[PDB]
Amino acid sequence: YQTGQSAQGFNRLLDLYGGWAGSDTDRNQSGQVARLTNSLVRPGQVVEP
Amino acid sequence: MNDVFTRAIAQADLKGSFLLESDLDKLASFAKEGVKRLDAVAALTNNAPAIISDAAHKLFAEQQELIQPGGNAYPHRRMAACLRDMEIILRYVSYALLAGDASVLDDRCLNGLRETYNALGTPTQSVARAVQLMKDAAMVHLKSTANVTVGDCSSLYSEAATYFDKAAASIA
Amino acid sequence: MNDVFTRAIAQADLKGSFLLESDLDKLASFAKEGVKRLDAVAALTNNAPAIISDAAHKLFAEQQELIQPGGNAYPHRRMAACLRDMEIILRYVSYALLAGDASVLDDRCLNGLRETYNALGTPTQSVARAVQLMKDAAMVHLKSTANVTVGDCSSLYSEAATYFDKAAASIA
Amino acid sequence: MNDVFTRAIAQADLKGSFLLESDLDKLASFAKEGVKRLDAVAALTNNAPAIISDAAHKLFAEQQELIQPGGNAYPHRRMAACLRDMEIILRYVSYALLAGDASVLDDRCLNGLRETYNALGTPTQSVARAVQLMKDAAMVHLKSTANVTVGDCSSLYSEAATYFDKAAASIA
Amino acid sequence: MNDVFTRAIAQADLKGSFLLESDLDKLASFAKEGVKRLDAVAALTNNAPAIISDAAHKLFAEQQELIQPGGNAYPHRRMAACLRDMEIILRYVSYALLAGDASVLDDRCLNGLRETYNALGTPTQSVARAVQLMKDAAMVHLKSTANVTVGDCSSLYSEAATYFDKAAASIA
Amino acid sequence: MSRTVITEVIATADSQGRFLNSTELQAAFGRFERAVPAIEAARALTKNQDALVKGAVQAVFKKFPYVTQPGEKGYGDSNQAKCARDIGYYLRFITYSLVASGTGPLDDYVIAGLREVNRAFNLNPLWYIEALNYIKGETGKLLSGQSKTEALLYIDHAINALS
Amino acid sequence: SRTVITEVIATADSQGRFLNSTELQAAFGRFERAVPAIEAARALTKNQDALVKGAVQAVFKKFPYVTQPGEKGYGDSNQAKCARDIGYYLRFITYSLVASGTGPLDDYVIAGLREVNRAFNLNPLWYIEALNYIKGETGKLLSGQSKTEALLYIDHAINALS
Amino acid sequence: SRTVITEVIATADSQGRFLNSTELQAAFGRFERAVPAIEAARALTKNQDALVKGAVQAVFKKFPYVTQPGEKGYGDSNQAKCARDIGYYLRFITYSLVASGTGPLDDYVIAGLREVNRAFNLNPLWYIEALNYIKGETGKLLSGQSKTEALLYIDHAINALS
Amino acid sequence: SRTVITEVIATADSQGRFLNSTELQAAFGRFERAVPAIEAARALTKNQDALVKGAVQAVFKKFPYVTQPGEKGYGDSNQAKCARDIGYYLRFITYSLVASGTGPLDDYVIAGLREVNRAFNLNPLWYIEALNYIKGETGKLLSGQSKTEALLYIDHAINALS
Amino acid sequence: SRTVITEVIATADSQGRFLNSTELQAAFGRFERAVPAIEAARALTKNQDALVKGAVQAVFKKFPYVTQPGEKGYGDSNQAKCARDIGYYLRFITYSLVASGTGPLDDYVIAGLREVNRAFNLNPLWYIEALNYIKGETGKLLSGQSKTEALLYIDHAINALS
């Protein structure tokens, strides 16, 4: 816990981490998409299109 | 985050109009009776270590599960984390009490606690019970007519109760 | 990031072979006629305020419910963000026009834009309409014969239209 | 990460007890074969380039499609990535061989490797085959009675083998 | 940061020759006396809090202006820093005693400490006296023949006394 | 996400991660004591919707006469009525900043993104500064005491942000 | 020191703009409540000896062992510096009351409290009971709002000790 | 944890290298005195109840007031809970002996010690006295190297309490 | 890949701006510099197999021991796959000519070159002087303007190998 | 440079803490291992010339083409440079043996080795096989755990080259 963080910062860092082996490669089949697009503006809820 | 003035202003703007004389009256009453709110917030802040101590004592007496070896509050490092979480949540209830709106709490504080504690495996039920214990141990500090001018503040007691209840119900 | 040359090169390498004669002919023709491409990219770069302003005027004169209170372009921060997104999309279209390949657009502006606009509630249909309006305003500017030598650039008109349509179809 | 000692300590602690006498017998044994363990680790460390080179040669003789253009080891960048992955895996195997506990592999080496390779399109079958070839190469240097006072150490060969199989099964 | 063995190594490199048998015998003597050296540094680290509290008591007894308002140690955090810096110099002296080289303390910090204590206006002779009292209190603990196999350690006491003397003189 | 004495003190206390000591509660008491002149100024300024907005529009036209004719921005019923709308927005967020007793509404709703949206639609900040100065002049005669002082303070903050 | 107006200049100088309405308002409120703080500090300035000796005897009676031989409460110089410590707490509470900010307290006592209590084996319970006794006598000597503002800096000192 | 082996592995991994001769020499030293450490652990485990009970009685003997009614130490609940705490401390001393390092102490006892004590108003001096008593008895119980290594872990705990 | 067009776009992109005069200036320079480069690529591609055979036999003539039994060049596989490696280098030089930038070289060859040469013991000198042979052969294979471009890329490959 | 003691002091000072049992443990292990490494380095010093001459003969027998004119190894000057480089490697092995750490070896040979070998086109395999020769001769010149430590240091130098 870092002073001043929101509750979500922990979950968002977990989403970013991807393990000790993983990396921020950009050589993936996907191409380095953004992970926290909806967790930031809809922090709690979930929406389907 | 949003106090009550900012919240009423947002609701006015979404309808795209000036503030009604009725909401002006509501905010005037809030400002007149915010001195009592200052007193209640001071009561929570000065007496925070007592509230956390009482809630911790009754929680770990009620639940040996937390402090036994292999328990979730055992290893004397998870214990400091427990007391720190209690500190944080009581701090955020004090914020949402001074402000007047639960937006501070459920935005800056408790969107992600359920799944944070699920990711750490800690029992969220025990955290909700800890928050309820904080509430009970806090109201007794909050009603004290010692060294505070006497008056009626039942609305503020209901407000603090609903903030503690919101935190507990979200974490649970 | 890519362009036409690097795309042909990547295809040839993934296949494992030198660039064939026909593909060399295609790239030579591209480089030979790239001066018209530079003129088009300059037409986009130099008139960009005019495109953005005309597109904004038309969008907000046909879709009023954006600028209304509660509309999703109401305050100056949201209107400024609207215009900034319009300029950025036009910028990446001019980029991809210079490069001859829409990879920079699809990698920096379009790979997470529909999701972002949905997560913000912005109507992606109106964003695509804004992009099409910018396309119209720009085509009024790429066909300008002032200050440039006369010639035919139907290919560049089609290419720029397809870049605007890629942006529209990947936001909508 | 846990060595064998810290693993036994955690097991004792969850039971809320001191360490039993059988556990201390086992740990005294483990510290009595610590010198043989050190030789095994030093034979892995000294012969690391030779093991990597042998495994690479045999892997690319076996699976020739890895180095055809379009294969997933074709340019120098991803060939260096092959060699780097293999060196890292041998490094972590030697780490776990020193510690006596496979906790370092799960903690660090294999924490997200499956996800990385599925994202990258890397054939995890080929990576596991590389690890198995690495095991075969390493045992040759482990079983080298040259320069170490002879004795029985088959337990250490079994431990190193099961570490290699652990990594190979995690990847594949 | 450097130890005596690496001093021999560095001077051997400078003269370009192999290590001579005389210096090699000196290093063997140091290596066998290292058993006593380890107990010396262990005594220092073990008794560090008692030593620092003792020397703080003696200093605040002999020097009093550090109590009075306007004295350097009168503000509360300032004498907190007094204790902290005493602990730091003891830690560095333990480092030097283990290494056998005085430069690990001097070249590390005494260069900047001189100018720092000149600028801060503190009585630097008081800090030198603090180092001297630190040396005396550590000397008292190092002669504890209980808990340790009895041996000859006059050279170690001389080494500690000279290390503290040089530290104070560099302070002074 | 706005700013108020309450919100600023809560945010600064949160950033250090602490309870509100004497200073924050003192500032909150200042705000809560202030909210009577501010709120009744917002009330007096709300009651004067149409006189204020219409006078401000007419003053913009008087000081910038060339805008009304064809070939300029202020031509046509739509542009003039929407001048009335824009001045209404400015006055409304001024009363919001009174009630909120902080420039959070003005900043968030008007002041952020002001300059870009003025350029990209070709709106002259002088038009709005003249209308604001007229509103300021007329609050001079509506409000008395500290209410006028804080209405003028917020009007001046908006004018500074335009200039 | 970080007083209310000092907070104003500090939180202003970090960013570009001048002192807006909020900072002027906070300074304003401090300027009203300062004068009652001044008279409260004066009223607290008349009773050094009574407050210090009452608090000393209260903490001694709560802790009978420190007085007894072999404990650090025993001694003439020890009790004299007990009195000097309580006088220090009193004067720094006075400074905080005068400044209308916890700046002097945080500067002069609270900064480095834990480490020195560690190294010199002092127990915060003694000082906390002394501050509770001072709370008690401020309850009688001061009345109304002055009492509130005095008690707020006092129980800030309690919150610092705890 | 921070063993010799684990600390070596971490320091080699952070530099992304294999274990060189210095690391293996340190590991050899660790394995070499694992035997005195395990023997000290075996003694301090066998003589468990005697150590715990003597430590508790020493805490009361040096702290008379703690046994007096109406406060912290009185009540068989607090008695059994003190015994549990001392069992914890000795357990982690033997854990550290086995793990040839201060891993278990630092992970369980040492980290988070002071906040939790100040929150429950537990005095460090009680535990320091109990560990001094355990030091005295394990001086008798152990001779040679086991004595010294045990004493190292005890005073490490004592220092962290101080 | 890093070319003139791509570098222009990335520079005007990272700064968050449109493409101003200098950027289109560089783009135009690339576009009209293309034709000599395209012709050089056509010539190198037409004369590919002869160039590879020449470079292979140059490797063997200058490094006569390499084909002797027991080491690298011995055996048919290593010669056929020498031819493969020289074909790769030639192909990427032509790729870099067509793109008029050192993108393809710095991506598919130069990035990761030292590690894979080290791990396979491939002496760089073999490739350096095979590229020197190709550098010479373009003198009588190309001439005029495109010769400077082809020499420039052969040259960059040689420098990266050294 | 870097020994066990030096790494002890560095790791202890990095965390800003006193010198606890784990690094005392590493220091004791190195201190016990001191004497055999001393004798090993002494034996190596007794055989400077024999070892270096044998090593250069080994490189000449394994790399015969080196000796021919027009190569690196032609000329008596390069012969003396062979001897000097081998002597430098041997001397730094003995320095590592005395210091009981790879420190002197690292910061004198390994530090910036690839760059220098690439600048003057020296081959690492020459020194690798020469160190294998020194390994073979010390396999008979020496005896005991001295073998294992000396061979570990030689192997570390080899692995640095490879």
Ligand SMILES: CCC1=C(C)/C(=C/C2=NC(=C\c3[nH]c(/C=C4\NC(=O)[C@H](C)[C@H]4CC)c(C)c3CCC(=O)O)/C(CCC(=O)O)=C2C)NC1=O
């Ligand atoms: C600003 C708002 C905010 C909150 C509230 C918050 C809570 C929070 N508590 C945490 C840890 C923890 N919290 C607890 C406490 C629980 N365990 C027992 O059940 C108790 C009954 C109960 C306390 C009520 C424990 C035991 C941990 C450590 C978990 C572990 O290490 O396994 C963590 C993980 C970080 C760490 O390990 O220190 C977070 C993020 N974080 C935030 O950013």
Ligand SMILES: CCC1=C(C)/C(=C/C2=NC(=C\c3[nH]c(/C=C4\NC(=O)[C@H](C)[C@H]4CC)c(C)c3CCC(=O)O)/C(CCC(=O)O)=C2C)NC1=O
């Ligand atoms: C620096 C921080 C600060 C604080 C804390 C503060 C509190 C404060 N409380 C006041 C009176 C008061 N305080 C309360 C609150 C009480 N009602 C119940 O009795 C409870 C015991 C308690 C709240 C649950 C009430 C009701 C009044 C009188 C107002 C009225 O009823 O008209 C007053 C008016 C004059 C006075 O009596 O002091 C102030 C200024 N002012 C400050 O500047």
Ligand SMILES: CCC1=C(C)/C(=C/C2=NC(=C\c3[nH]c(/C=C4\NC(=O)[C@H](C)[C@H]4CC)c(C)c3CCC(=O)O)/C(CCC(=O)O)=C2C)NC1=O
């Ligand atoms: C510094 C940046 C830069 C610019 C601005 C630039 C413009 C430029 N445009 C040119 C010709 C031209 N420009 C155009 C484009 C126009 N004609 C079409 O009808 C449209 C009206 C319009 C484009 C949609 C055409 C078609 C040519 C002749 C094509 C050719 O050069 O073969 C030429 C060569 C002169 C000639 O052959 O007539 C230049 C240098 N070059 C640059 O390096």
Ligand SMILES: CCC1=C(C)/C(=C/C2=NC(=C\c3[nH]c(/C=C4\NC(=O)[C@H](C)[C@H]4CC)c(C)c3CCC(=O)O)/C(CCC(=O)O)=C2C)NC1=O
């Ligand atoms: C815990 C330590 C650790 C591991 C284990 C690890 C694996 C790992 N391998 C990678 C790339 C790679 N890994 C491989 C490995 C296999 N492919 C197969 O064909 C062969 C068996 C072998 C070829 C050498 C390859 C080919 C790549 C390159 C993928 C690419 O760049 O497209 C990448 C990142 C891709 C990037 O740079 O963007 C990671 C994280 N990383 C770590 O920090």
Ligand SMILES: CCC1=C(C)/C(=C/C2=NC(=C\c3[nH]c(/C=C4\NC(=O)[C@H](C)[C@H]4CC)c(C)c3CCC(=O)O)/C(CCC(=O)O)=C2C)NC1=O
């Ligand atoms: C500087 C780092 C360091 C190392 C490397 C080290 C190794 C080491 N190996 C030893 C012997 C030994 N080493 C081995 C292990 C080998 N036997 C072979 O058969 C196996 C192939 C191989 C196991 C992989 C054995 C079996 C012994 C005989 C003593 C015993 O069994 O414990 C000894 C005891 C002395 C002796 O009896 O000769 C040590 C200290 N010590 C160190 O301080």
Ligand SMILES: CCC1=C(C)/C(=C/C2=NC(=C\c3[nH]c(/C=C4\NC(=O)[C@H](C)[C@H]4CC)c(C)c3CCC(=O)O)/C(CCC(=O)O)=C2C)NC1=O
């Ligand atoms: C880690 C190595 C290190 C050392 C050794 C060191 C010395 C040091 N002590 C300082 C403060 C201080 N140091 C002292 C101590 C002295 N004053 C007298 O009372 C005593 C005789 C004597 C105690 C030994 C005091 C009183 C201060 C407070 C001065 C101030 O804050 O203005 C400062 C100023 C900033 C700071 O570090 O807090 C330095 C640089 N700094 C370092 O980074």
Ligand SMILES: CCC1=C(C)/C(=C/C2=NC(=C\c3[nH]c(/C=C4\NC(=O)[C@H](C)[C@H]4CC)c(C)c3CCC(=O)O)/C(CCC(=O)O)=C2C)NC1=O
């Ligand atoms: C666990 C960490 C560790 C330590 C602490 C350590 C030091 C250590 N000191 C020892 C004995 C000793 N210890 C001392 C030092 C003491 N003798 C007294 O006279 C002095 C006042 C005092 C100096 C501080 C001496 C002199 C010896 C005997 C060595 C000799 O023959 O001189 C021994 C051998 C036990 C024996 O001789 O029976 C060791 C291993 N080694 C370690 O691995």
Ligand SMILES: CCC1=C(C)/C(=C/C2=NC(=C\c3[nH]c(/C=C4\NC(=O)[C@H](C)[C@H]4CC)c(C)c3CCC(=O)O)/C(CCC(=O)O)=C2C)NC1=O
């Ligand atoms: C948050 C508060 C807020 C403000 C302040 C605001 C200003 C604003 N003015 C706009 C256009 C405009 N604004 C004016 C104002 C002119 N009309 C003339 O009678 C006057 C001389 C002058 C006013 C003093 C005009 C003529 C336009 C139309 C420009 C055009 O689209 O061609 C627009 C674009 C929307 C549209 O054209 O319908 C905005 C968003 N919007 C907001 O949401």
Ligand SMILES: CCC1=C(C)/C(=C/C2=NC(=C\c3[nH]c(/C=C4\NC(=O)[C@H](C)[C@H]4CC)c(C)c3CCC(=O)O)/C(CCC(=O)O)=C2C)NC1=O
């Ligand atoms: C900046 C303000 C400041 C504070 C807060 C402060 C606390 C303080 N009190 C001290 C001495 C002391 N203070 C006490 C008083 C306590 N023990 C008894 O049990 C009493 C019940 C209780 C009094 C409330 C005692 C007994 C000592 C003796 C320790 C010594 O020998 O220094 C010391 C040691 C140095 C000295 O003063 O000579 C400090 C640092 N010092 C300061 O300069």
Ligand SMILES: CCC1=C(C)/C(=C/C2=NC(=C\c3[nH]c(/C=C4\NC(=O)[C@H](C)[C@H]4CC)c(C)c3CCC(=O)O)/C(CCC(=O)O)=C2C)NC1=O
């Ligand atoms: C990881 C190892 C670990 C430690 C060290 C630890 C200390 C510890 N002791 C506790 C209780 C306690 N501990 C004591 C102290 C003892 N009682 C007296 O008889 C003695 C004088 C004294 C010991 C010398 C007391 C009095 C309590 C109860 C305090 C209370 O209920 O408020 C508690 C609170 C849990 C509970 O309410 O039962 C903790 C966390 N906990 C741990 O998990």
Ligand SMILES: CCC1=C(C)/C(=C/C2=NC(=C\c3[nH]c(/C=C4\NC(=O)[C@H](C)[C@H]4CC)c(C)c3CCC(=O)O)/C(CCC(=O)O)=C2C)NC1=O
């Ligand atoms: C992207 C472009 C690319 C390059 C440049 C490349 C070089 C390359 N050459 C290799 C093998 C090799 N390359 C050679 C080259 C030698 N053969 C003759 O003898 C000459 C003396 C000399 C060539 C001038 C040899 C002998 C090997 C086999 C060595 C071994 O298997 O260890 C390998 C190892 C994989 C394999 O071929 O089995 C690579 C990666 N690979 C690539 O994917």
